[PDB]
Paper text:
Consistent with its absence from primate mt tRNAAla sequences, the human mt AlaRS/tRNAAla system was recently shown to be insensitive to a G3:U70 identity element.
Thus, adaptive evolution of the Hs mt AlaRS/tRNAAla recognition system was accompanied by a radical reorganization of its recognition system, moving the center for tRNA recognition from sequence-specific (G3:U70) readout in the acceptor stem to C-Ala-mediated sequence-unspecific readout of the tRNA’s elbow structure.
Residue numbers in the entry: 786 to 986
The structure:
């Protein structure tokens, strides 16, 4: 009873600290993700915690706000880094029919955002990108232009790509993503561009 109320008060104080941290925000995306996870776990604990109902649900309101602004913030920061790298690749490539290259990324979400921005700004171009990860792992994301032939499907594209790397692929005809592991990146890049060109007839 009293102990539960005290714990709830501590949680609220903790909640206040978390909110302050959020206002402050964090430069590292990883720390932003960690904060969102702390929000989810904390809300789950409050859900089954013992305390007066009014305070419990009032705090639930505050913390749900905290999660919305936290997740919105992390999504914005990923959009920022993805935009910067997207411009970095835009400066040196021509808007050809097909652009197949590699870009350094920290997570697959950011890579996907790069592909979507790139296709949004170059509508008549199909895109595939690979990201090297430590310890030999490799990520893949690709998107096919809407104007492109329907015979060209992204899922089969990344399907062959990761299929050569022994990985896995998933998506739809328009967008696809996958994982693999291979020493030579130019082999996967060459297979992707070869296949895609073979379809683009």
């Amino acid at each position: 009873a009293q102990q539960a109320r005290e714990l709830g008060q501590s949680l609220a104080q903790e909640v206040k600290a978390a909110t302050e941290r959020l206002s402050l925000g964090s430069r590292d995306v990883a720390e932003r993700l960690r904060l969102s996870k702390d929000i989810g776990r904390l809300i789950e604990a409050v859900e089954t915690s013992v305390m007066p109902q009014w305070q419990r649900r009032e705090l639930l309101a505050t913390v749900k706000m905290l999660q919305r602004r936290a997740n919105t913030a992390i999504r914005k920061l990923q959009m920022g880094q993805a935009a910067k790298k997207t411009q970095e690749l835009l400066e040196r490539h021509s808007k050809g029919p097909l652009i197949v290259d590699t870009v350094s990324a920290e997570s697959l979400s950011v890579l996907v955002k790069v592909v979507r921005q790139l296709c949004e700004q170059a509508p008549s171009t199909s895109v595939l990108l690979l990201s090297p990860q430590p310890m030999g792992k490799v990520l893949c994301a690709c998107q096919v232009a809407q104007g492109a032939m329907p015979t060209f499907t992204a899922e089969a594209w990344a399907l062959a790509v990761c299929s050569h790397m022994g990985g896995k692929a998933w998506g739809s005809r328009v967008v696809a993503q996958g994982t693999g592991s291979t020493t030579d990146l130019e082999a996967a890049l060459s297979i992707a561009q070869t296949y895609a060109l073979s379809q683009l007839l």
